[PDB]
Design a protein around this ligand. Structure first.
Ligand SMILES: *[C@@H]1O[C@H](CO)[C@@H](O[C@@H]2O[C@H](CO)[C@@H](O)[C@H](O)[C@@H]2O)[C@H](O)[C@H]1NC(C)=O
Ligand SMILES: *[C@@H]1O[C@H](CO)[C@@H](O)[C@H](O)[C@H]1NC(C)=O
Lengths: 49, 48
């Protein structure tokens, strides 16, 4: 709450349990490679509930 | 034949197989297992 950001992006998708661990910069898998690749120099937060 | 086995020996006697004179495409290794931990140390899985 003490930061000022220029643009904020909120990509939302429902996915399995282990693919929650899959999503991270510089990762791999059936989803991380062909469905959703985060940029290595990711500066942000991912959220799973 | 290292992932389709049925009796992966106990840790007290770790079975060790040698892989040579062949071409390795680890996508078969990927699709034969719903992976839980792929911690590689000397080489990164992506460009393997
Ligand atoms: C470790 O597990 C391997 C699974 O592929 C075994 O390889 C097989 O061994 C059988 C004989 O047990 C061969 O007939 C077959 O061609 C294949 O090579 C390997 O033997 C096993 N090693 C030990 C020490 O258990
Ligand atoms: C090899 O794997 C397939 C699919 O997981 C399975 O149906 C088959 O029984 C396995 N073979 C042996 C010898 O365990």
């Amino acid at each position: 709450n003490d930061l000022c950001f220029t643009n904020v992006y909120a990509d939302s998708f429902v996915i399995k349990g282990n693919e929650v661990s899959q999503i991270a910069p510089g990762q791999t898998g059936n989803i991380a490679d062909y469905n959703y690749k985060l940029p290595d120099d990711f500066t942000g937060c991912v959220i799973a509930w | 034949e290292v992932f389709n086995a049925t009796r992966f020996a106990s840790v007290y006697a770790w079975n060790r197989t040698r892989i040579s004179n062949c071409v390795a495409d680890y996508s078969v290794l990927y699709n034969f297992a719903p992976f839980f931990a792929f911690k590689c140390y000397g080489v990164s899985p992506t460009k393997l």
